Design an enzyme around this catalytic site. Structure first.
Site, PDB file in Angstrom:
ATOM      1  N   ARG A   1       1.164  -4.437  12.323  1.00  0.00           N
ATOM      2  CA  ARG A   1       0.513  -4.677  13.606  1.00  0.00           C
ATOM      3  C   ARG A   1       0.985  -6.017  14.186  1.00  0.00           C
ATOM      4  NH1 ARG A   1      -0.111  -0.053  13.787  1.00  0.00           N
ATOM      5  NH2 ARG A   1      -2.060   1.159  14.110  1.00  0.00           N
TER       6      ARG A   1
ATOM      7  N   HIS B   1       7.496   0.402  19.135  1.00  0.00           N
ATOM      8  CA  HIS B   1       6.485   1.012  18.256  1.00  0.00           C
ATOM      9  C   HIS B   1       6.852   2.454  17.871  1.00  0.00           C
ATOM     10  CE1 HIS B   1       1.921   0.602  17.143  1.00  0.00           C
ATOM     11  NE2 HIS B   1       2.538   1.404  16.297  1.00  0.00           N
TER      12      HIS B   1
ATOM     13  N   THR C   1      -5.335  -8.052  -4.052  1.00  0.00           N
ATOM     14  CA  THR C   1      -5.453  -7.645  -5.458  1.00  0.00           C
ATOM     15  C   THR C   1      -4.086  -7.139  -5.945  1.00  0.00           C
ATOM     16  OG1 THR C   1      -7.750  -6.944  -5.107  1.00  0.00           O
ATOM     17  CG2 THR C   1      -6.667  -6.114  -7.079  1.00  0.00           C
TER      18      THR C   1
ATOM     19  N   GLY D   1       0.822  -1.193   0.000  1.00  0.00           N
ATOM     20  CA  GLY D   1       0.000   0.000   0.000  1.00  0.00           C
ATOM     21  C   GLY D   1       0.859   1.245   0.000  1.00  0.00           C
ATOM     22  N   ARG D   2       0.378   2.278   0.663  1.00  0.00           N
ATOM     23  CA  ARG D   2       1.135   3.534   0.748  1.00  0.00           C
ATOM     24  C   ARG D   2       2.537   3.252   1.310  1.00  0.00           C
ATOM     25  NH1 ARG D   2      -4.443   5.454   2.675  1.00  0.00           N
ATOM     26  NH2 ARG D   2      -3.782   4.077   4.383  1.00  0.00           N
ATOM     27  N   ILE D   3       2.572   2.551   2.439  1.00  0.00           N
ATOM     28  CA  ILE D   3       3.852   2.321   3.131  1.00  0.00           C
ATOM     29  C   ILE D   3       4.645   1.172   2.472  1.00  0.00           C
ATOM     30  CG2 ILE D   3       5.023   1.864   5.307  1.00  0.00           C
ATOM     31  CD1 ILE D   3       2.566   3.243   6.686  1.00  0.00           C
TER      32      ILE D   3
ATOM     33  N   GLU E   1       1.269  -4.826  23.484  1.00  0.00           N
ATOM     34  CA  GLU E   1       2.163  -3.711  23.843  1.00  0.00           C
ATOM     35  C   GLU E   1       1.675  -3.055  25.143  1.00  0.00           C
ATOM     36  OE1 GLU E   1       2.381  -1.112  20.381  1.00  0.00           O
ATOM     37  OE2 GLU E   1       2.655  -2.882  19.064  1.00  0.00           O
TER      38      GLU E   1
HETATM   39  N1  LIG Z   1       4.699   0.648  13.287  1.00  0.00           N
HETATM   40  C1  LIG Z   1       4.014   1.765  13.096  1.00  0.00           C
HETATM   41  O1  LIG Z   1       4.165   2.762  13.815  1.00  0.00           O
HETATM   42  C2  LIG Z   1       3.061   1.892  11.972  1.00  0.00           C
HETATM   43  C3  LIG Z   1       2.294   0.862  11.535  1.00  0.00           C
HETATM   44  N2  LIG Z   1       1.367   1.074  10.526  1.00  0.00           N
HETATM   45  C4  LIG Z   1       0.521  -0.006  10.017  1.00  0.00           C
HETATM   46  O2  LIG Z   1       0.715  -0.129   8.606  1.00  0.00           O
HETATM   47  C5  LIG Z   1      -0.560  -0.435   8.025  1.00  0.00           C
HETATM   48  C6  LIG Z   1      -0.503  -0.180   6.522  1.00  0.00           C
HETATM   49  O3  LIG Z   1      -0.460   1.222   6.280  1.00  0.00           O
HETATM   50  P1  LIG Z   1      -0.616   1.810   4.796  1.00  0.00           P
HETATM   51  O4  LIG Z   1       0.458   1.216   3.914  1.00  0.00           O
HETATM   52  O5  LIG Z   1      -0.805   3.291   4.943  1.00  0.00           O
HETATM   53  O6  LIG Z   1      -2.059   1.157   4.434  1.00  0.00           O
HETATM   54  P2  LIG Z   1      -2.666   0.905   2.959  1.00  0.00           P
HETATM   55  O7  LIG Z   1      -4.161   0.758   3.173  1.00  0.00           O
HETATM   56  O8  LIG Z   1      -2.122   1.915   1.985  1.00  0.00           O
HETATM   57  O9  LIG Z   1      -2.081  -0.517   2.519  1.00  0.00           O
HETATM   58  C7  LIG Z   1      -2.556  -1.739   3.059  1.00  0.00           C
HETATM   59  C8  LIG Z   1      -1.953  -2.882   2.272  1.00  0.00           C
HETATM   60  O10 LIG Z   1      -2.249  -4.124   2.903  1.00  0.00           O
HETATM   61  C9  LIG Z   1      -2.899  -4.983   1.960  1.00  0.00           C
HETATM   62  N3  LIG Z   1      -3.841  -5.879   2.670  1.00  0.00           N
HETATM   63  C10 LIG Z   1      -4.829  -5.493   3.485  1.00  0.00           C
HETATM   64  N4  LIG Z   1      -5.484  -6.696   3.985  1.00  0.00           N
HETATM   65  C11 LIG Z   1      -4.816  -7.720   3.421  1.00  0.00           C
HETATM   66  C12 LIG Z   1      -4.956  -9.098   3.495  1.00  0.00           C
HETATM   67  N5  LIG Z   1      -5.932  -9.651   4.256  1.00  0.00           N
HETATM   68  N6  LIG Z   1      -4.107  -9.892   2.790  1.00  0.00           N
HETATM   69  C13 LIG Z   1      -3.130  -9.364   2.023  1.00  0.00           C
HETATM   70  N7  LIG Z   1      -2.959  -8.030   1.938  1.00  0.00           N
HETATM   71  C14 LIG Z   1      -3.796  -7.219   2.632  1.00  0.00           C
HETATM   72  C15 LIG Z   1      -3.577  -4.043   0.971  1.00  0.00           C
HETATM   73  O11 LIG Z   1      -3.862  -4.591  -0.320  1.00  0.00           O
HETATM   74  P3  LIG Z   1      -5.271  -5.305  -0.646  1.00  0.00           P
HETATM   75  O12 LIG Z   1      -6.372  -4.380  -0.180  1.00  0.00           O
HETATM   76  O13 LIG Z   1      -5.223  -5.470  -2.141  1.00  0.00           O
HETATM   77  O14 LIG Z   1      -5.216  -6.571   0.143  1.00  0.00           O
HETATM   78  C16 LIG Z   1      -2.537  -2.952   0.865  1.00  0.00           C
HETATM   79  O15 LIG Z   1      -1.517  -3.293  -0.096  1.00  0.00           O
HETATM   80  C17 LIG Z   1      -1.539   0.408   8.857  1.00  0.00           C
HETATM   81  O16 LIG Z   1      -2.899  -0.043   8.846  1.00  0.00           O
HETATM   82  C18 LIG Z   1      -0.958   0.308  10.246  1.00  0.00           C
HETATM   83  O17 LIG Z   1      -1.557  -0.743  11.010  1.00  0.00           O
HETATM   84  C19 LIG Z   1       1.383   2.283   9.789  1.00  0.00           C
HETATM   85  C20 LIG Z   1       2.033   3.342  10.232  1.00  0.00           C
HETATM   86  C21 LIG Z   1       2.787   3.279  11.505  1.00  0.00           C
HETATM   87  O1  LIG Z   2      -1.126   3.407  12.590  1.00  0.00           O
HETATM   88  C1  LIG Z   2      -0.318   4.164  13.156  1.00  0.00           C
HETATM   89  O2  LIG Z   2      -0.041   5.279  12.688  1.00  0.00           O
HETATM   90  C2  LIG Z   2       0.346   3.703  14.381  1.00  0.00           C
HETATM   91  O3  LIG Z   2       0.918   2.591  14.373  1.00  0.00           O
HETATM   92  O4  LIG Z   2       0.345   4.424  15.400  1.00  0.00           O
END
Ligand SMILES: NC(=O)C1=CN([C@@H]2O[C@H](COP(=O)(O)OP(=O)(O)OC[C@H]3O[C@@H](n4cnc5c(N)ncnc54)[C@H](OP(=O)(O)O)[C@@H]3O)[C@@H](O)[C@H]2O)C=CC1
Ligand SMILES: O=C([O-])C(=O)[O-]
Ligand SMILES: NC(=O)C1=CN([C@@H]2O[C@H](COP(=O)(O)OP(=O)(O)OC[C@H]3O[C@@H](n4cnc5c(N)ncnc54)[C@H](OP(=O)(O)O)[C@@H]3O)[C@@H](O)[C@H]2O)C=CC1
Ligand SMILES: O=C([O-])C(=O)[O-]
Ligand SMILES: [Cl-]
Ligand SMILES: [Cl-]
Ligand code: NA
Ligand code: NA
Lengths: 317, 317
Positions: free
Chosen positions: A228, A275, A172, A149-151, A257
């Site tokens: 997560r 975290h 997808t 996704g974004r990250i 956590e």
């Molecule tokens: N450690 C930290 O501090 C941080 C952790 N996070 C975590 O990172 C996560 C992702 O962030 P971001 O990239 O912005 O989110 P996005 O929504 O941009 O990306 C999510 C990705 O996960 C995939 N995905 C979701 N469900 C499934 C599944 N069941 N099986 C396979 N792939 C899946 C999606 O593709 P598709 O829909 O095609 O499956 C997509 O590529 C956040 O929700 C957050 O929990 C983010 C920031 C900080």
């Molecule tokens: O999702 C986030 O930004 C987090 O992990 O705090």
């Protein structure tokens, strides 16, 4: 001025900026027991961490929950949607910071840099000579991104410059990119030796990284989790590390956590972080601004900046 | 079979492979006092670290010094050249490894990842809560590379993927690249807030990173040194950190290794490593192979694999 509830701890920048448009209502914890009758006119919540449903449902005039963080699994978005409450998160403003942390964690896991610094700081360089060579390296590795996704995409762009092969698993495919798609997680794990986890914490990702995935990853296998803690079967990971099923792990997130299992602390091939992936002043300032600016946009124009996919709502007043 | 001297410590892989063609002669330290009359037929040296001139000049039949490492400032190449002795180093095989470490060190310096891991491992996450936010970040930075050779270019390629501006300073520009050249070090330091040092340790780079360069770098300034300790005025760096002239530093190399000044150990905005940039098993195995393969090529064909620029010599027997 609309009244915004801030339960528990939040970045002070949020508190500093809410008065631009709002009256702030503070409670010490995210706990429905702390809600008094005088608070029943509250129209919004700004929150970092979990928002229990009983707290959310204590406010009959609630219009918006502004989540601090891109992950919003601490909010029951199904219940919010059923009540017509919009939920906002903080995507984009943390993408590059989190991708940076992921790479740092990967390098620390592979090359043991934190341990090498300890060796020096403890006086061992002088007394004993060189820090032992790291058994692992990034050189020659093949990386599989669970999530793109974004990250995940930002992580992949970084890794392209390190001369490693890149594959990914998502529900997808994202065509247009030059990366190898795998339709199953276990299939990707078979093919790669380095697994980076960056999916949201949902029912579909719960313990997705399990014993079968770790066995497939294999004996040179390195697991990096910046998504997560729920997504990794933490007991299975400890077992895999104990038995030499995989070669190492770097974790920013955990099942419960701030508690980290004692066994995970014992392994010399594991890097652990509390975290911290978005935890710089500049990025948390940007996240704070986006929480407040969502609330300001909602109450001034009826359109939030970054509503979540489950709540594509417009304000009715 | 030619006799090869190995003074002091070296990677065991070198010792394991020398018997393919050579008789090995070991001494405990790189010290001319340890040379006995029976060693005067030695024809080559394999060395990691300094090779004092009196030791080198104890061997009248010496043909080749095979240095373990791409830097060869521990060998007096001017004296070797004057004696018609070829000197070989280990370029290329460590380039990507060192570039990896440089990025890890940069991220650890900016985001305090080693300190965050210590916070967790010491139990502080539980009672004290979150690790404090890092005052610094890579986000928005502008990076200046002092040196843009094999390793500097590899570092720049990585940094391109992190979304930061890149500039460089070398004596001669490398046109064809999209990076901004600065004809002076101090001019680059003015323009950037992040200075990465990756030049050799020569008379021309001796204390090049001095008080003027650090003042120009400025109050958001971060210094990363993965080249040679000699290139940084270490006393000036301590002063700059003490006064807040610069914001942080990450150092893999030092003026008088393994000694690191006590003052440098006290700063919470400094990351320190015991000269580990190439220190993985895979990369050190490759460096070992290149030392031995240089010696084998020399004695079998009269042409070394990686002679240094100062000694473009062919064997006369
Ligand atoms: N450690 C930290 O501090 C941080 C952790 N996070 C975590 O990172 C996560 C992702 O962030 P971001 O990239 O912005 O989110 P996005 O929504 O941009 O990306 C999510 C990705 O996960 C995939 N995905 C979701 N469900 C499934 C599944 N069941 N099986 C396979 N792939 C899946 C999606 O593709 P598709 O829909 O095609 O499956 C997509 O590529 C956040 O929700 C957050 O929990 C983010 C920031 C900080
Ligand atoms: O999702 C986030 O930004 C987090 O992990 O705090
Ligand atoms: N910490 C570690 O473990 C490691 C440290 N090193 C160190 O890194 C150094 C660089 O290695 P590598 O990139 O392979 O070497 P290269 O010879 O490929 O590159 C050297 C670079 O330094 C520049 N340079 C040399 N002198 C000056 C000067 N006076 N002013 C400005 N630029 C200068 C060169 O350009 P120009 O000639 O145009 O000035 C060139 O860009 C090694 O010599 C070694 O000391 C390397 C590997 C491991
Ligand atoms: O120059 C090198 O390779 C070193 O630093 O050992
Ligand atoms: Cl915060
Ligand atoms: Cl070694
Ligand atoms: Na695998
Ligand atoms: Na500057």
């Amino acid at each position: 001025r609309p009244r915004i509830l801030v339960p528990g701890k939040i970045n002070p920048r949020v508190l500093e900026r809410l008065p631009e448009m709002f009256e702030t209502v503070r409670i010490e914890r995210a706990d429905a027991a702390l809600v008094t009758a005088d608070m029943r006119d509250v129209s919004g919540i700004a929150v970092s961490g979990k928002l229990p449903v009983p707290l959310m449902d204590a406010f009959p005039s609630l219009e918006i929950v502004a989540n601090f963080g891109v992950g919003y699994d601490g909010v029951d978005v199904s219940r919010a949607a059923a009540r017509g409450i919009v939920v906002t998160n903080t995507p984009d403003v943390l993408t590059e910071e989190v991708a940076d942390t992921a790479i740092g964690l990967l390098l620390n896991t592979l090359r043991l840099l934190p341990q090498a610094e300890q060796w020096l700081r403890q006086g061992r360089w002088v007394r004993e000579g060189a820090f032992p060579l790291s058994p692992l390296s990034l050189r020659g590795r093949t990386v599989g991104l669970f999530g793109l996704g974004r990250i995940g995409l930002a992580i992949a762009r970084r890794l392209e410059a390190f001369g490693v092969s890149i594959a990914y698993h998502t529900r997808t495919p994202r065509e247009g990119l030059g990366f190898t798609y795998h339709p199953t997680l276990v299939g990707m794990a078979e093919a790669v030796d380095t697994l980076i986890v960056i999916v949201p914490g949902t029912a579909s990702t719960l313990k997705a990284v399990n014993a079968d995935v770790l066995s497939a990853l294999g004996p040179k296998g390195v697991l990096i989790n910046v998504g997560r803690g729920s997504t990794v079967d933490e007991a299975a990971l400890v077992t895999a590390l104990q038995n030499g099923t995989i070669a190492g792990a770097g974790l920013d997130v955990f099942e419960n956590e701030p508690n980290v299992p004692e066994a995970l602390l014992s392994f010399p091939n594991v890097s652990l972080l509390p975290h911290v992936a978005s935890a710089s002043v500049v990025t948390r300032n940007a996240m704070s601004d986006l929480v407040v600016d969502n609330l300001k946009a909602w109450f001034s124009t009826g359109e939030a900046l970054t509503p979540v996919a489950e709540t594509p709502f417009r304000r009715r007043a």
